[PDB]
């Protein structure tokens, strides 16, 4: 299972920032226009229409990958071995790998 | 905000009809202030 | 296949490069709240399970 | 405890992020749910929230909890810290940003903590499903039965092997630090933190002032101000604004980490086995939906698998 | 022996120059140190030595 | 707050109606549910009680609630006014006989207010259904998406 | 027949003798706790109902 981490966006309050693709798995970026965010304190910056937001997200391995994960294998002929146990005459049972 | 809409002390835009109706819409309670 | 078995293909458990095809698409944060909304295909591994 | 795990969370600070519904309507709740990660088996889930648990204002004591009611931190006793999915979950352990509970299945996750005049809850739409381990779909963990490998989350705070990234908190918006003094604006300084001011009185006025500064602006509305505190870190949530190009990164241990443990699974009642010539009749009376898989031992496997819920009979 | 950079001061990563209590001499410097050295293989050696007070 | 929104209620008084379940059995409860009216979209339901919320015998204070402990009215600070359908609901607002609460999709509507020692809770069998708006069914209002028109009980009292 | 209609057969409602075929296996306690774990076919009467 994946986990889609979302880095904190940037808000270039007035003006615009463009974004640059980065070597991350299934990276996505998209600059939005005229955001006008509001935070707990106020309106996060002044100019009503000219406020952009980075909004980049990129997906990575989930932490549970270290514990549960399907492994894909290409299987070849390999070898065959057995455990056998032998008794002959008076000798008691003796076992070994072969 | 819009001219037909009230602006709270914290910039938040609400409808004018929702002013001094007793219920603290804005986080800081600015709409219900200056209520004679 | 964009979410059916192979959607997170890591060459080994600690590889630095991994292939991810989840059709992640971002969305407009709306209504003057700051967040990074995104919609993407659910995990293929869960579907396989 | 006092080793690396809790000591390391001295650098972090709580933060105020947009919760989707605290009670009613969006808000900026001190405890904002982020990444409720339910993938473990027995119903244990983990929530990464915006309010730290185990810190206090100086030192680490488990019973306390630190959260931001504004620009100022605030440490209180853990008075009623409840996680509720559809019924009240049971808290397993809370460490730093993270809180681990055992939850019945449900369609929302909500966390709430009191300070005594306020409720401070947050809810989020996450589908958390009870994931049974084994071949019998049971709704709560059994008392007895058969142990099976099962991935859980640890209730060891112990620091190992995983990490989260916490950067410098970008400039945080605030306007209560703007006051009209005499006929013009006045920005007040927090006694240790810079404040960056942007007012368009109609030619742009900027500056990062560390002392109480008065600019030439008439009303409070046309000014905006943001305090810069660098002493502490914050998790780089998608819900916090980041400081433009100031992309410096950090690391922090994540307390609860997935591991493989043994979880008890239920044992179905022994089927009534009845014999006929070349036929085996099995009367099965399961108490939970149970798998039954048969395969011949000859060349042709003839694998027949099915789920049994009702008491049935199979030949 | 592993080796961490702090702002044109190379140094080891099991002792910093702020040994007694790093987070009380200069917190800002603590975090700028723990953020420059982000991909340092020995980052837990750095953290346990930049968070240890007395 | 008082212009006409709440002053009107000085005439109305609480009453003691029969509740289907007082918590173990049938009793006349100071808070009797009548007309749980859930037809909104988000799971918001408006429920009509037999108690005056936000009225105090002398006048409005909007943290008080009046109810009849007999022939005699009495007004108390709202100690825990809780609504519950399958999990505790979120009390959006209260005014006069009505309380507006956001509720999980449950199967029985319960209200209750403490007095001191006493519980004073009532429960009615009414199906509360979460009514998603749009072309996808969704068990709880998302964080993000697309705004669509919906009908919801306004929390303004006007 | 251990759980279809006859699993409890008492001749009268207050008869000391009693027939019972609930297929009562007795599992071992685990992990060093004191309890008597049993598996048992559910009630035939419930199934019949
Ligand atoms: C077969 O080998 C096993 C493995 O060593 C041994 O324990 C057993 O005694 C042998 N068979 C018999 C009949 O003794
Ligand atoms: C054989 O299987 C059928 C279908 O489940 C069942 O009705 C029938 O009773 C089985 N045979 C016997 C002898 O019970
Ligand atoms: C580190 O020191 C050298 C020598 O004094 C100097 O040239 C260099 O600029 C310094 N590093 C920085 C980042 O200023
Ligand atoms: Ca109002």
CB contact under 8 A, A43 and B11: yes
Reference D158, options D38, D259, D61; nearest CA is: D259
d(CA B22, CA B32): 7
In contact, E23 and D60? CB cutoff 8 Å? no
> Could you say which of D23, D125, D127 has the minimum Cβ distance to residue F143?
D125
Do domains D172-235 and D265-315 share one topology? The answer is yes
Task: Please name which ligand lies nearest the alpha carbon of D272.
Answer: 2
Q: How far is D265 from chain G (nearest CA, A)?
A: 13
* Mutation target vs A (from C45, C46, C47, C48; most A CBs, 10 A cutoff): C45
CATH topology of domain D2-168+251-264: Immunoglobulin-like (2.60.40)
Q: What DSSP designation does G42 have?
A: P
In contact, D41 and D263? CB cutoff 8 Å? yes
CA atoms F90, F95, F96, F100: torsion sign:
negative
CB contact under 8 A, G39 and D268: yes
3 state SS of A25: coil
Reference D257, options D54, D12, D5, D85; nearest CA is: D5
What is the helix (H) or strand (E) element at residue A21, kind and residue range?
none
Q: D284: nearest CA in chain G?
A: G41
d(CA D192, CA D24): 36
Please state which CATH number belongs to domain D172-235: 2.60.40.4310
CATH topology of domain D265-315: Immunoglobulin-like (2.60.40)
The answer to whether the CB of A8 is under 6 A from ligand 1 is no
d(CA F85, CA F99): 14
d(CA F112, CA F99): 11
Please state which CATH number belongs to domain F2-158: 2.60.40.3200
CB contact under 8 A, D241 and C34: yes
Largest CA distance in chain D: 104
CB contact under 8 A, A59 and C33: no
The answer to whether the CB of A66 is under 6 A from ligand 1 is no
Tally the C-alpha atoms within 13 A of residue G25's C-alpha that lie toward its C-beta. 12
Q: Which long-range contacts (CB under 8 A, 24 or more apart) does E43-48 make?
A: E43/D251, E43/E13, E44/D4, E44/D159, E44/D253, E45/E2, E45/E13, E45/E14, E46/E4, E46/E13, E46/E16, E47/D4, E47/D8, E47/D251, E47/D253, E48/D4, E48/D8
d(CA D207, CA F66): 56
Task: Please name which ligand lies nearest the alpha carbon of D284.
Answer: 2
3 state SS of D148: strand
Residue with tokens 């609400």: B14
Q: What DSSP designation does F74 have?
A: E
Reference D98, options D9, D161, D23, D17; nearest CA is: D9
Distance of CA C24 to the CA centre of its chain: 6
The answer to whether the CB of A85 is under 6 A from ligand 1 is yes
Task: Please name which ligand lies nearest the alpha carbon of E9.
Answer: 3
> Could you say which of A45, A47, A64 has the minimum Cβ distance to residue D39?
A64
The residues, ordered by sequence, that sit 6+ positions from F95 with a Cβ below 8 Å of its Cβ are F5, F6, F9, F53, F54, F157
Query: Where do the structural domains in chain F lie, given as residue ranges?
Result: 2-158
Resolution reading in Å: 3.6
CB contact under 8 A, D269 and G41: yes
In contact, D150 and D44? CB cutoff 8 Å? no
**Strand extents, DSSP E, D25-103:** 34-37, 44-55, 60-68, 73-77, 82-84, 90-102
Cα(D16) to ligand 1 centroid in Å equals 68
Q: D272: nearest CA in chain G?
A: G2
Number of neighbouring beta carbons within 10 Å of residue F152: 15
> Could you say which of E30, E43, E53 has the minimum Cβ distance to residue D251?
E43
CA distances from D101 to D51, D55, D90, D154 (A): 16, 19, 5, 11
Read off the tokens for D226.
């943001």
Kindly calculate the radius of gyration of chain A based on its CA atoms and give it in whole angstroms: 31
The residues, ordered by sequence, that sit 6+ positions from D234 with a Cβ below 8 Å of its Cβ are D12, D13, D15, D166, D167, D168, D169, D240
Reference D35, options D159, D136, D141, D164; nearest CA is: D164
CB contact under 8 A, D241 and A46: no
For residue A62, the cross-strand partners are none
Judging contact as 3 or more Cβ pairs under 8 Å, the answer for B and A is yes
């Amino acid at each position: 299972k994946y986990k889609t981490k979302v880095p904190s966006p940037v808000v270039k309050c007035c003006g615009a920032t463009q974004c640059t693709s980065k070597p991350h798995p299934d990276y996505q970026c998209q600059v939005f226009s005229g955001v006008y965010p509001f935070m707990w304190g106020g309106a996060y910056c002044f100019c009503d229409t000219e406020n952009t937001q980075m909004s980049e997200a990129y997906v990575e391995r989930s932490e549970e990958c270290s514990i549960d994960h399907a492994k894909a294998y290409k299987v070849h002929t390999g070898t065959v071995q057995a455990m056998v146990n032998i008794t002959y005459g008076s000798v008691s049972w003796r076992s070994a790998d072969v | 905000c819009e001219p037909s809409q009230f602006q709270c002390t914290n910039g938040r835009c609400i409808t004018l009809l929702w002013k001094c109706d007793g219920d603290e819409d804005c986080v800081d309670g600015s709409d219900e202030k200056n209520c004679v | 296949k964009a979410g059916s078995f192979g959607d997170l293909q890591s060459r080994t458990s600690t590889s630095n490069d991994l292939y991810a095809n989840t059709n992640l698409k971002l969305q407009r944060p709306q209504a003057g709240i700051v967040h990074t909304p995104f919609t993407q295909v659910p995990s293929g591994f869960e579907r396989w399970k | 405890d006092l080793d690396t795990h809790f000591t390391q969370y001295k650098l972090a600070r709580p933060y105020i992020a947009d919760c989707p519904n605290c009670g009613h309507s969006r808000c900026d709740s001190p405890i904002a749910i982020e990444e409720v990660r339910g993938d473990a088996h027995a119903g244990v889930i983990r929530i990464q929230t915006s309010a730290m648990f185990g810190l206090k204002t100086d030192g680490v004591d488990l019973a306390y909890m630190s959260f931001m009611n504004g620009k100022t931190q605030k440490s209180i006793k853990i008075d009623n810290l409840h996680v509720r999915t559809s019924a009240p979950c049971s808290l397993v352990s809370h460490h730093g940003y993270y809180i681990l509970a055992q939850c019945p299945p449900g369609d929302t996750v909500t966390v709430g903590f009191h300070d005594g005049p306020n409720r401070h809850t947050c809810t989020v739409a996450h589908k958390v499903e009870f994931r049974p381990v084994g071949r019998e779909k049971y709704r709560h963990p059994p008392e007895h039965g058969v142990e099976l490998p099962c991935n859980r989350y640890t209730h060891k705070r112990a620091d190992q092997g995983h990490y989260v990234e916490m950067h410098q908190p970008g400039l945080v918006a605030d306007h209560s630090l703007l006051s009209i003094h005499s006929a013009k604006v006045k920005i007040t300084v927090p006694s240790g933190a810079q404040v960056k001011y942007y007012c368009k009185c109609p030619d742009v006025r900027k500056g990062i002032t560390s002392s109480d500064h008065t600019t030439t602006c008439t009303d409070v509305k046309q000014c905006r101000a943001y305090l810069i505190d660098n002493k502490k870190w914050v998790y780089n949530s998608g819900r916090l604004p980041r400081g433009e190009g100031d992309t410096f990164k950090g690391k922090l241990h994540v307390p609860f980490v997935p591991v493989k443990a043994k979880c008890i699974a239920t044992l179905a009642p022994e089927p009534l086995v009845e014999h006929k010539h070349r036929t085996l009749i099995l009367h099965l009376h399961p108490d939970h939906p149970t798998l039954l898989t048969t395969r011949s031992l000859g060349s042709d496997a003839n694998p027949t698998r099915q789920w049994i819920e009702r008491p049935t009979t199979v030949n | 022996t592993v080796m961490c950079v702090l702002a044109n001061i190379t140094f080891p990563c099991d002792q910093p120059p702020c040994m007694p209590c790093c987070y009380e001499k200069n917190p800002h410097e603590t975090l700028t140190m723990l953020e420059q050295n982000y991909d340092s293989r020995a980052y837990d050696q750095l953290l346990d030595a930049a968070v240890k007070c007395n």
